[PDB]
Write a protein that binds this DNA or RNA. Structure first.
Length: 108
RNA sequence: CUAAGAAAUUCACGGCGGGCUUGAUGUCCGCGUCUACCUGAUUCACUGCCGUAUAGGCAG
């Protein structure tokens, strides 16, 4: 999304009590939905806004510039199989490679 | 029915200034290489004659 809009993500990435405020907003809790408000229904619509950062917006779509690749089924069929780029897996493998190449226990 | 399908890197250029690598040196003792064979498979497609012949035949 927008790079100037990442203040919401820096606000959601806080580890205030023992966990993220995101997962505190997923489950029903008394400390949740009451700290950030003085009205009830306003806190409900703020929850339904703030929990929507993990929900896909819009109809499912893969662009013409995106990749989608037929896969033959065992009987006579095909599935379209549009693959996406795993940025979390690339970030995990990239962190593993930087830790194995540049880490303190590797430099030792 | 292929991480499918698509694509102009390109223009120009002074690397050269200079130089002592030197001395010195024990390679060295010793040694069983034997054994046994078909080059011959048509392996020399030859030399010459009659004929105008390259076509064809003939002699040794």
């Amino acid at each position: 999304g927008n790079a100037a809009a990442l203040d919401v993500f820096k606000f959601l990435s806080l580890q205030y009590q023992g966990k993220n405020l995101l997962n505190w907003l997923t489950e029903d809790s008394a400390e949740a939905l009451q700290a950030l408000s003085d009205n009830a229904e306003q806190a409900r619509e703020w929850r339904q806004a703030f929990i929507g950062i993990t929900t896909v917006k819009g109809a499912p779509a893969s662009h013409s510039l995106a990749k989608q690749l037929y896969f033959p089924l065992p009987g006579s069929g095909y599935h379209l199989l549009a693959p996406l780029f795993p940025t979390s897996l690339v970030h995990h493998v990239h962190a593993l490679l930087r830790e194995a190449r540049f880490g303190d226990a590797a430099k030792a």
